[PDB]
Amino acid sequence: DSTECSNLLLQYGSFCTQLNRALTGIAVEQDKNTQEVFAQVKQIYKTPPIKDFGGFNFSQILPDPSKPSKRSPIEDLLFNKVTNGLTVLPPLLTDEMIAQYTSALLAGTITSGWTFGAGPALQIPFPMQMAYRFNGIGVTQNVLYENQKLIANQFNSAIGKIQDSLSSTP
Amino acid sequence: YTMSLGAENSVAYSNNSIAIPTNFTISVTTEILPVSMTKTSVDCTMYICG
Amino acid sequence: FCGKGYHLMSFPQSAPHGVVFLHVTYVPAQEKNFTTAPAICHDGKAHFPREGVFVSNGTHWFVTQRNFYEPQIITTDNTFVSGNCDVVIGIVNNTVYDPLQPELDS
Ligand SMILES: *[C@@H]1O[C@H](CO)[C@@H](O[C@@H]2O[C@H](CO)[C@@H](O)[C@H](O)[C@H]2NC(C)=O)[C@H](O)[C@H]1NC(C)=O
Ligand SMILES: *[C@@H]1O[C@H](CO)[C@@H](O[C@@H]2O[C@H](CO)[C@@H](O)[C@H](O)[C@H]2NC(C)=O)[C@H](O)[C@H]1NC(C)=O
Ligand SMILES: *[C@@H]1O[C@H](CO)[C@@H](O[C@@H]2O[C@H](CO)[C@@H](O)[C@H](O)[C@H]2NC(C)=O)[C@H](O)[C@H]1NC(C)=O
Ligand SMILES: *[C@@H]1O[C@H](CO)[C@@H](O[C@@H]2O[C@H](CO)[C@@H](O)[C@H](O)[C@H]2NC(C)=O)[C@H](O)[C@H]1NC(C)=O
Ligand SMILES: *[C@@H]1O[C@H](CO)[C@@H](O[C@@H]2O[C@H](CO)[C@@H](O)[C@H](O)[C@H]2NC(C)=O)[C@H](O)[C@H]1NC(C)=O
Ligand SMILES: *[C@@H]1O[C@H](CO)[C@@H](O)[C@H](O)[C@H]1NC(C)=O
Numbered sequence: 001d002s003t004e005c006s007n008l009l010l011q012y013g014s015f016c017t018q019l020n021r022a023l024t025g026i027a028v029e030q031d032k033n034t035q036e037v038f039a040q041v042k043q044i045y046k047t048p049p050i051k052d053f054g055g056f057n058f059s060q061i062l063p064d065p066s067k068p069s070k071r072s073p074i075e076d077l078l079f080n081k082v083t084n085g086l087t088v089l090p091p092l093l094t095d096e097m098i099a100q101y102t103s104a105l106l107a108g109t110i111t112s113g114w115t116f117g118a119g120p121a122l123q124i125p126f127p128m129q130m131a132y133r134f135n136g137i138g139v140t141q142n143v144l145y146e147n148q149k150l151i152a153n154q155f156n157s158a159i160g161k162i163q164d165s166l167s168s169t170p
Numbered sequence: 171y172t173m174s175l176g177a178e179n180s181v182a183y184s185n186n187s188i189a190i191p192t193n194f195t196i197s198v199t200t201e202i203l204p205v206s207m208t209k210t211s212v213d214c215t216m217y218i219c220g
Numbered sequence: 221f222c223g224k225g226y227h228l229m230s231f232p233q234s235a236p237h238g239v240v241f242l243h244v245t246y247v248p249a250q251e252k253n254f255t256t257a258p259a260i261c262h263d264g265k266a267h268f269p270r271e272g273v274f275v276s277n278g279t280h281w282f283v284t285q286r287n288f289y290e291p292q293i294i295t296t297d298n299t300f301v302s303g304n305c306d307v308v309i310g311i312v313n314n315t316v317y318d319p320l321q322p323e324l325d326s
Pocket of ligand 3: 180181182189251252253
């Protein structure tokens with residue numbers, strides 16, 4: 001609040017304007033980064049009420065209706081595990097809207113595969129989508145269909161191990 | 171206002187139904203990428219002292 | 221990486237201090253619902269599409285390519301046999317045509 005200090009500071013020119021402009025550029029760049037990463041879909045997709053995906057369990061990654069934050073158990077664990085003229089500007093996208101974007105992406109990739117990323121979301125059963133992914137890596141569809149229960153059990157076990165590993169590693 | 175993230179779309183998922191496209195659109199989109207800047211040189215002695 | 225949609229090709233254009241890419245992409249449109257199955261049960265054998273997907277318009281079963289609707293008759297030339305019908309969940313019963321059958325019939 002010193003007037004004499006500000007009067008002497010005016011002799012140095014537009015240094016303060018340069019620093020404020022650089023900080024403003026960084027601040028808008030962070031919001032641009034969040035838009036580029038998370039806002040890649042213009043449709044907010046939702047999962048069906050019946051979670052019949054041919055044995056595949058997505059409860060650890062889908063949003064929990066019981067929680068007010070509408071986050072997944074994995075996302076909730078991630079948020080719990082992360083802890084003089086200065087101002088902190090809030091982010092343009094809040095955490096619930098970012099979680100909503102991730103939920104839309106999860107619903108699109110579960111119910112429609114990769115179709116929603118290239119155009120309109122085309123529904124496909126999840127085992128058939130997994131068979132398409134199996135064909136992408138050079139494994140025939142029959143291998144997926146014959147061992148569907150084993151693949152679903154392995155996927156559920158791996159997702160549970162991911163949650164345990166995140167909860168158990170500092 | 172509070173922003174709207176996107177238009178709501180509920181995909182009609184069921185265990186035995188698929189959606190197959192019957193037509194297509196040839197879409198051309200623009201992507202602008204900067205490559206170079208203006209090449210500037212400053213004579214340090216002339217700038218500071220003339 | 222090269223536009224929104226399935227990328228077909230791209231064109232470069234010079235710009236002052238920059239480049240403009242015209243990305244020509246293929247976007248699916250006018251989608252239609254069909255009833256689908258993982259496999260076709262015929263003669264105690266399970267048939268799976270070689271490159272397409274089994275679809276049904278309500279009464280008849282066909283095989284089509286995944287990114288465009290072009291229904292074709294389910295034959296031995298566009299399907300492959302792996303195992304019986306007891307393992308695949310959701311297999312349906314439909315006939316599989318054989319192109320060689322009229323050749324030895326005549
Ligand atoms: C999907 O996985 C979740 C979590 O692993 C299962 O929820 C469990 O259900 C059992 C039996 O009802 C409970 O004893 C557990 O406490 C539940 N776990 C949690 C974290 O809530 C769920 O049953 C699985 N299957 C489906 C179809 O959702
Ligand atoms: C697929 O969509 C194209 C449009 O891109 C359709 O072409 C149009 O057909 C109508 C009726 O024949 C014409 O009046 C329009 O002028 C056509 N548009 C163009 C750009 O040619 C085409 O008929 C559609 N095909 C199917 C099977 O639905
Ligand atoms: C495929 O079928 C589903 C359900 O039979 C259609 O989804 C319905 O679309 C209408 C019109 O938008 C909605 O009013 C209904 O609520 C939707 N039902 C459900 C369960 O989501 C879907 O539009 C059909 N798709 C095509 C291309 O015909
Ligand atoms: C599903 O598609 C098939 C093939 O296009 C339809 O079968 C044809 O139906 C017409 C209408 O009576 C007949 O004139 C043709 O002879 C049929 N073809 C064959 C090979 O039988 C079938 O009717 C369609 N089903 C529905 C519900 O639309
Ligand atoms: C599909 O066809 C198979 C074989 O033709 C049917 O399986 C038969 O089912 C009857 C009654 O359920 C049994 O008595 C036979 O012994 C079964 N045969 C075999 C080889 O398993 C099957 O039920 C048919 N499915 C539908 C929906 O019609
Ligand atoms: C789809 O689910 C129903 C029960 O809701 C079941 O009767 C049917 O066999 C299932 N079909 C497939 C292909 O899994």
